[PDB]
Design a protein around this ligand. Structure first.
Ligand SMILES: *[C@@H]1O[C@H](CO)[C@@H](O[C@@H]2O[C@H](CO)[C@@H](O[C@@H]3O[C@H](CO)[C@@H](O)[C@H](O)[C@@H]3O)[C@H](O)[C@H]2NC(C)=O)[C@H](O)[C@H]1NC(C)=O
Lengths: 193, 117, 110
């Protein structure tokens, strides 16, 4: 049996920053989801469109594993219909999103006493994002009416999360994996057992 | 048609022990999680213990750690709960319940075993 | 620790509607699924609503519900109360900090 590499997605040593979230395609494999919905390691596990008791035996053309690191307090923004700094400028899910949002506390992996500033998020943008878009430009953001000229009310659009082991839970890092599912006119390639 | 049949309750002295069990029929244990849910007289429900399909992993409410042990025999279609060092706090009816997946619903409940201290 | 709370006493005349809330505390109710149970006095609780807003076969369509992320709360509503709908209703959700959390329970009369 050719099993889908959910292990590799969830056990990755490094996750992308939310401003530049990663995407991996899962196809032409057997998707065993029993390893995801039967564990207590996740703090968040919520599916939209398809029930966890049904997706286990449904066939799809693609499963997209989108992954990133955000603050625990911002986990609630990773949902259809949501708004906020992450939902609007970093990672937008469509109102008709089908798939599962899975997240867990990674305070023992992604934070340091001296401050782990290697995880960035977009703080400013001229407008919000299209669902599943990605914007990794670093063009200086002009907040006011004064031209930035590439360099007051002009900001480097990204900011770091000061992730530290002593932060309270809402300020601890969370690893988020969003499995977006779709069925196209194309023949399905990803079936469960 | 599924049924959960509890037994092994009754009175128990403070500081003692009793083994509760819950026989099942109509379904296979290999496909379900089993849980115990406690209901003190006149109060709402609270969760006590959880065992997964293979018996390889167990969870408990923190308030019973070191006092309760959950186990299951897939061949005998019987769930067990061994509870030691009971206190007055522990008087309750104990329901066993079937859960399809960990974070999902408890879609079938037994009638409940009365345990008093 | 994450916990759910509920109104103790809820009631309304038959034929009218009722809302039974469940609010989160020191955690997000919307991060997991919310279940609702109905326990008639004298017997075991059964599922009425599960996975936020749906219901198992055997449950009439007068029982519905939703989760309001912005209020960190969830609720079920009953329309067209029947005198049959006399029970203690409970909300339930899962957390990693504390595995299964049941709400206090709402005593509903008609
Ligand atoms: C990511 O990698 C981890 C391993 O680092 C996978 O964890 C797996 O967790 C299960 C449940 O605890 C382990 O099963 C148990 O193993 C112990 C022995 O350590 C045994 O005594 C128990 O009876 C039970 O069999 C499983 O072994 C462990 N996997 C490995 C390779 O150790 C986790 O599942 C991976 N994530 C994903 C999405 O695959």
């Amino acid at each position: 049996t050719n099993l889908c590499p959910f292990g590799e997605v969830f056990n990755a040593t490094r996750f992308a920053s939310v401003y530049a979230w990663n995407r991996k395609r899962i196809s032409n494999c057997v998707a065993d989801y029993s390893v995801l919905y039967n564990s207590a390691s996740f703090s968040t596990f919520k599916c939209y469109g398809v029930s966890p008791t049904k997706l286990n035996d449904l066939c799809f053309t693609n499963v997209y594993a989108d992954s990133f690191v955000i603050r625990g307090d911002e986990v609630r923004q990773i949902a259809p219909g949501q708004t906020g700094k992450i939902a609007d400028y970093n990672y937008k899910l469509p109102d008709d999103f089908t798939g599962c949002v899975i997240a867990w506390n990674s305070n023992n992996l992604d934070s340091k006493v001296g401050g782990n500033y290697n995880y960035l998020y977009r703080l400013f943008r001229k407008s919000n994002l299209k669902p599943f878009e990605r914007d990794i430009s670093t063009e200086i953001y002009q907040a006011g009416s004064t031209p930035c000229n590439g360099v007051f009310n002009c900001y480097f659009p990204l900011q770091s999360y000061g992730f530290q082991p002593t932060n309270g839970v809402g300020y601890q890092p969370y690893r988020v994996v969003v499995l977006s599912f779709e069925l196209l006119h194309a023949p399905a390639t990803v079936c469960g057992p | 048609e599924v049924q959960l049949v509890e037994s092994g309750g009754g009175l128990v002295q403070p500081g003692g022990s009793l083994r509760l069990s819950c026989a099942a029929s109509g379904f296979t244990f290999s496909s379900y999680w089993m849980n115990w849910v406690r209901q003190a007289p006149g109060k709402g429900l609270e969760w006590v213990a959880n065992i997964k399909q293979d018996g390889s992993e167990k969870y408990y409410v923190d308030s019973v750690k070191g006092r309760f042990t959950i186990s299951r025999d897939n061949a005998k279609n019987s769930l067990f709960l061994q509870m030691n060092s009971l206190r007055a706090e522990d008087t309750a009816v104990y329901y066993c319940a079937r859960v399809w997946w960990l974070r999902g619903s408890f879609d079938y409940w037994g009638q409940g075993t009365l345990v008093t201290v | 620790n994450f916990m759910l709370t509920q109104p103790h006493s809820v009631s309304e005349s038959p034929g009218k509607t009722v809302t039974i809330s469940c609010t989160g505390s020191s955690g997000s109710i919307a991060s997991n699924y919310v279940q609702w149970y109905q326990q008639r006095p004298g017997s075991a609780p059964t599922t009425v609503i599960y996975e936020d807003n749906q219901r198992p076969s055997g449950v009439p369509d007068r029982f519905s519900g939703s989760i309001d992320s912005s209020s960190n709360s969830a609720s079920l509503t009953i329309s067209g109360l029947k005198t049959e709908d006399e029970a203690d209703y409970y909300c339930q959700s899962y957390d990693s900090s504390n595995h299964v959390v049941f709400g206090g329970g709402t005593k509903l009369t008609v």
